[PDB]
Amino acid sequence: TLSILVAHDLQRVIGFENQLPWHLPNDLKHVKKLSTGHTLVMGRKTFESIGKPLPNRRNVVLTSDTSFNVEGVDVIHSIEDIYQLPGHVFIFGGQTLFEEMIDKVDDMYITVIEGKFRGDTFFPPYTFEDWEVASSVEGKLDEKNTIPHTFLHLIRK
Numbered sequence: 001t002l003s004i005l006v007a008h009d010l011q012r013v014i015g016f017e018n019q020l021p022w023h024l025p026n027d028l029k030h031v032k033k034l035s036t037g038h039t040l041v042m043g044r045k046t047f048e049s050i051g052k053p054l055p056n057r058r059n060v061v062l063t064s065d066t067s068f069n070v071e072g073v074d075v076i077h078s079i080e081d082i083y084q085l086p087g088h089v090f091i092f093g094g095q096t097l098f099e100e101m102i103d104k105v106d107d108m109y110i111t112v113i114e115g116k117f118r119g120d121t122f123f124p125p126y127t128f129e130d131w132e133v134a135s136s137v138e139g140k141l142d143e144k145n146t147i148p149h150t151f152l153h154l155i156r157k
């Protein structure tokens with residue numbers, strides 16, 4: 001299975017200055033729950049933003065840099081390499097990866113951040129004409145999680 005995993009706001013903002021624009025611990029818990037024991041494929045900028053591979057899953061980085069050889073990270077140099085990866089593969093970002101993969105993935109796990117942030121990177125437009133809502137679950141708000149959010153699982157029709 002090839003899936004997208006993304007958090008985007010009401011206007012599809014995903015990033016600002018190589019970070020996520022919002023602080024939302026519950027979204028990280030969601031990422032942990034979904035991708036632990038599986039595979040993340042991410043662009044080089046996303047990797048450098050996190051600085052180290054996420055524990056307890058295979059971290060795969062897509063880059064043209066042939067000098068890229070980082071401990072605990074597997075490197076790939078082509079989109080085509082993604083299709084050779086075993087098991088459940090999550091396309092993890094950033095903008096460039098999402099743009100390249102949205103027409104290719106089986107499904108998408110989207111955290112809709114129900115606010116409007118300043119962004120410099122975006123998830124590409126998509127329409128519910130193409131995507132069945134397998135589930136939609138409102139995130140719980142508390143002291144540590146103060147921005148409304150909804151977890152969507154969309155499956156290509």
Ligand SMILES: NC(=O)c1ccc[n+]([C@@H]2O[C@H](COP(=O)([O-])OP(=O)(O)OC[C@H]3O[C@@H](n4cnc5c(N)ncnc54)[C@H](OP(=O)(O)O)[C@@H]3O)[C@@H](O)[C@H]2O)c1
Binds near residue numbers: 014015064078092097
């Ligand atoms: N909200 C979210 O769900 C989410 C998730 C992840 C990231 N983000 C955000 O997204 C933003 C970064 O996105 P971005 O588009 O600027 O960068 P990115 O997608 O993380 O990485 C771009 C880099 O990936 C490599 N790459 C992509 N396609 C390639 C290909 N076909 N062949 C070889 N290399 C390829 C290139 O690396 P080289 O230049 O080294 O060749 C390229 O410069 C940040 O703000 C980050 O915080 C948001």
Ligand SMILES: COc1ccc(-c2cc3nc(N)nc(N)c3cc2C)cc1OC
Binds near residue numbers: 007027028054110111
């Ligand atoms: C505060 O640190 C972090 C903040 C945000 C993220 C982060 C959250 C994410 N959330 C979702 N739904 N999807 C992604 N593809 C995603 C990617 C990253 C990189 C990851 C972080 O650390 C690994």
